[PDB]
From a paper:
In this work, we sequenced, cloned and overexpressed a spider [name] (PpAK), an enzyme crucial for rapid energy energy fluxes in invertebrates. AK has a similar function to creatine kinase (CK) from vertebrates (ATP: N-creatine phosphotransferase, EC 2.7.3.2,) providing fast energy during muscular contraction by the back-phosphorylation of ADP by phospho-arginine. In AKs and in phosphagen kinases in general, the canonical fold is comprised of two domains; a small N-terminal globular domain and a large C-terminal α-β domain. Interestingly, the active site is located between both domains and a large conformational change occurs during catalysis as a hinged rotation (Zhou, Ellington & Chapman, 2000).
Besides the biochemical characterization, we obtained the crystallographic structures of PpAK in substrate-free from (apo-Pp-AK) and in a binary complex with the guanidino group substrate-arginine (Arg-PpAK) at 2.1 and 2.0 Å resolution, respectively. The structure of substrate-bound PpAK was obtained by soaking crystals of the apoAK in 20 mM arginine dissolved in the crystallization solution. Using a Polder map, which is an omit map where the bulk solvent is excluded during calculations, generated a much better electron density that supports modeling L-arginine into the active site and the interactions with PpAK side chains. Arg-PpAK binary complex was found is the open conformation similar to the free substrate PpAK model. Superposition of both structures do not show overall conformational changes upon arginine binding (RMSD = 0.36 Å for C-α atoms). Arginine-substrate carboxylate is stabilized by hydrogen bonds to backbone Gly64, Val65 and Gly66 and the hydroxyl group of Tyr68 to arginine amino group. The guanidino group of the arginine substrate has specific contacts in the active site. A salt bridge with Glu225 and a hydrogen bond with Cys271 position the substrate in a region with poor density. Comparing the apo vs. Arg-bound PpAK structures, it is observed that the Glu225 carboxylate lateral chain is slightly rotated to favour a hydrogen bond of arginine guanidino group end. In the PpAK-Arg structure we found that Glu225 is positioned in a similar way, making only one salt-bridge with NH2(ω)-1 of the arginine guanidino group end. This small local conformational change was also observed in LvAK-Arg structure and it is postulated to lead to a productive active site in the closed conformation.
Author numbering: 1 to 310, 321 to 357
Write the structure that this text describes.
Amino acid sequence: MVDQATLDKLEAGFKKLQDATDCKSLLKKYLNREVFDQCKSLKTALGATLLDCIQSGVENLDSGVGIYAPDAEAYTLFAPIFNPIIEDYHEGFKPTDKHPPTDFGDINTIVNVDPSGKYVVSTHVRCGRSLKGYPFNPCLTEANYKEMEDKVSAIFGTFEGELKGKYYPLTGMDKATQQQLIDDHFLFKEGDRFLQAANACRYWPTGRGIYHNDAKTFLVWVNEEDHLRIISMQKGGDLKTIFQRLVNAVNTIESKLPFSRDDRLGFLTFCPTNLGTTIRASVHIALPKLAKDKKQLEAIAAKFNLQVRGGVYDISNKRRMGLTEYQAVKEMQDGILEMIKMEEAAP
Ligand SMILES: NC(=[NH2+])NCCC[C@H](N)C(=O)O
Ligand code: NA
Ligand code: NA
């Protein structure tokens, strides 16, 4: 049962969201009274309540989304509020829809997106994973964090080949090590107010750490937002080598530690934006001609299901759910190939 103290905070939060007439989060949009009354008295098997989902969007009213998952069960148990937010954010992933089974596909159909070297500065493929049996960061204990780091660092120690590298615990990290990792853009810090209000940064820095291979083309963040954030990257556009490295790595990890995955949602993540494939495939790319009209540059990316962010821009696949890991990477690749064709043919 939910304790009366949590029920009281929940009721105060619900009212606070209705009184913020100018607040525009997805949480506020879909947390109406009936959805709230459906959910407020539920509790997962690991002890997570609705407050462990919505507290950050109650405390930060400028949140774009405003909800996080405190454990894997919370996605199903609290479906009445998660499902409409997931649908909205992922642009048509309905409550009755289903994400495909995992498929990394035929890696040999993946190509270098810019053999010319003229346009793509670097290419990157990011994924995320939760480890089966562990709550998510809102509900992990100090002992969980410690035990998880022990198991994860043990696995990283077995990496050989191009994956062989070093684990750096944040606990007891010295300032020279930190500066070394900042220079590599490999360091993460305590979360901002959105994560703080979500109870994601408790017992910092216990259980948090960084791994990277000697080549500095592979990086893992442990307990930064998800249990594991796994990135493969390098200069140039060799998406084939990059993606295959990521897959080798994820498969190696999985062989020792099972992941949390849902038949409807795919891979379960702390934020609902990272569900499904979890894949974020991107290039840092300069398109001088196409970009001299940023509205049309954004329009062009938008036609290939791409998102432009921060001369050199980050262009990535917008879609995470409803498509396989292969299809997601292939969509970035085909979109980038086309935009380069356009840039090369533009006057
Ligand atoms: N982990 C993330 N990037 N989540 C996306 C949303 C972040 C923040 N809670 C917001 O809703 O604005
Ligand atoms: Na989306
Ligand atoms: Na193409």
